[PDB]
């Protein structure tokens, strides 16, 4: 196939162009709602943590696939491992609200706590980049899912439910230094 | 809109008065039955405690929203954390009835105990204020939901079920000392 390149129209040639045959494909695993629905770690927890999804690792599965979109919407699930009770306040709450049990408070069971949180931001969508400020490198302070608090939190996991992504951005792979391709060890049985 | 003020009739102007448009509203969160249905703390527990809802903190969510009504009706749920067994006697019972196991007695399981209690007061409604006395600042002694007893009680939580409020009263906010508005810290992600 030949076409006008500078017009930027999408062109999809087939193997039928020289006698081949396009085969049936199944793309269940690259579905946006499917791939973002797994628990991923948040490796900076405090006694008080504000749930911000831009704190996932930038090279993880969900972390990187979230950096590869401009806007997003999602509910949330969290798995917290804490001592004492765990208080959650929604988006917009004072920081002093986290010391009272009128808010969602979880009395700790043995292994950990697994909750489901809604989307409470005042905006229709959240963003991973922001060109500018919001007061009178840093996103607006209203780009969060709430805050949690315990006497000490050991680990935090998050999961995106009903995820929707908009306006894709670059997504990079590890760079090849001098090789012909990036070679690494792949699992193979012993002996 | 202009009206006679001293007549005390309610007046609701709209933004349509100068070309605007009244938007659709959802008031599910300021529903009386919805907002009063959360566990709230009772921070003065004894070996013997008489369940009186006017012992909730006056500035909590449920505590303050209950002080903002003259009369009320409700069932109850309690979460008690005790040592030994927990006896409950209804409204009107002798204090010596609390030492016998013919009354509702809960043999303690591991974390705590969660029960549901009915409304047993002899009146149609209970009140938060009373102008006068009841014998021949202090409410009548029949304004309670019963009593509990254990060897020592560590914490008590209560929850109002099927709540009904009547005759609203003033509900205040924290006062602003000298500012233009009350400024406080609001949750925002780190970095």
């Amino acid at each position: 196939t030949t076409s006008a390149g500078e017009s930027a129209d999408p062109v999809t040639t087939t193997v039928e162009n020289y006698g081949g045959e396009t085969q049936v494909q199944r793309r269940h695993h690259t579905d946006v709602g499917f791939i973002m629905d797994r628990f991923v770690k948040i490796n900076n927890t405090n006694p008080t943590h504000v749930i911000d999804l831009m704190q996932t690792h930038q090279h993880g599965l969900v972390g990187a696939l979230l950096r590869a979109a401009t806007y997003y919407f999602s509910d949330l699930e969290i798995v917290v491992r804490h001592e004492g009770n765990l208080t959650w306040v929604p988006n917009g709450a004072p920081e002093a609200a986290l010391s009272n049990a009128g808010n969602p408070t979880a009395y700790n069971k043995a292994p950990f706590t697994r909750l489901a949180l809604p989307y409470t931001a005042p905006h229709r969508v959240l963003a991973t980049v922001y060109n500018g400020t919001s007061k009178y490198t840093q996103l607006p302070a209203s780009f969060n899912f709430g805050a949690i608090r315990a006497t000490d939190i050991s680990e935090l996991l998050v999961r995106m439910k009903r995820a929707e992504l908009y306006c894709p951005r670059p997504l990079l792979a590890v760079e090849v230094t001098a090789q012909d391709r990036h070679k690494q060890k792949i699992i193979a049985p012993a002996k | 809109t202009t009206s006679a003020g001293e007549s005390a009739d309610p007046v609701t102007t709209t933004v349509e008065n100068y070309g605007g448009e009244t938007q659709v509203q959802r008031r599910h969160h300021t529903d009386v039955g919805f907002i009063m249905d959360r566990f709230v703390k009772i921070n003065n527990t004894n070996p013997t405690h008489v369940i009186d809802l006017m012992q909730t903190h006056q500035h909590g969510l449920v505590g303050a929203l209950l002080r903002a009504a003259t009369y009320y009706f409700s069932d109850l749920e309690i979460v008690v954390r005790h040592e030994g067994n927990l006896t409950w006697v209804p409204n009107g019972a002798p204090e010596a009835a609390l030492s016998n196991a013919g009354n509702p007695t809960a043999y303690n399981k591991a974390p705590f105990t969660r029960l549901a209690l009915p409304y047993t007061a002899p009146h149609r409604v209970l009140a938060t204020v009373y102008n006068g006395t009841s014998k021949y600042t202090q409410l009548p002694a029949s304004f309670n939901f019963g009593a509990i007893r254990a060897t020592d009680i560590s914490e008590l939580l209560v929850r109002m079920k099927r709540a009904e409020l009547y005759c609203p009263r003033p509900l205040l906010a924290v006062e602003v000392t000298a500012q233009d508005r009350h400024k406080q810290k609001i949750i925002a992600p780190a970095k």
Partner: nanobody
Amino acid sequence: QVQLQESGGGLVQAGDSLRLSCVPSVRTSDNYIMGWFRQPPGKEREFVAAIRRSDGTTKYAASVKGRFAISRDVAKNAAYLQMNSLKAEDTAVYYCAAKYQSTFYSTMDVQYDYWGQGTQVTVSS
């Protein structure tokens, strides 16, 4: 998680009074039990007095029962150990502690979680 800030230590002589204070760093909604442990010179740590956060249920040691008094401030989230009529034996290193995990009276002096660095109280004669 939680760090404890102690205040009010120093030096006195026999017959006077001292006031120790301790405020935790976070104000979580738990039922923690603030207590006081003391370690005399050349001896091991021991319990002095504890108090529950919900009510004012106070434990004490046989040594200091009528002299010492412990209280809590619901507003400022503090606890105070009012030491009275000190004896020359009251010279020690006084530690506070937290005990968040369980809040029953019978175990109110056995297993605390966060200590916080101790204060020095050296009474003279």
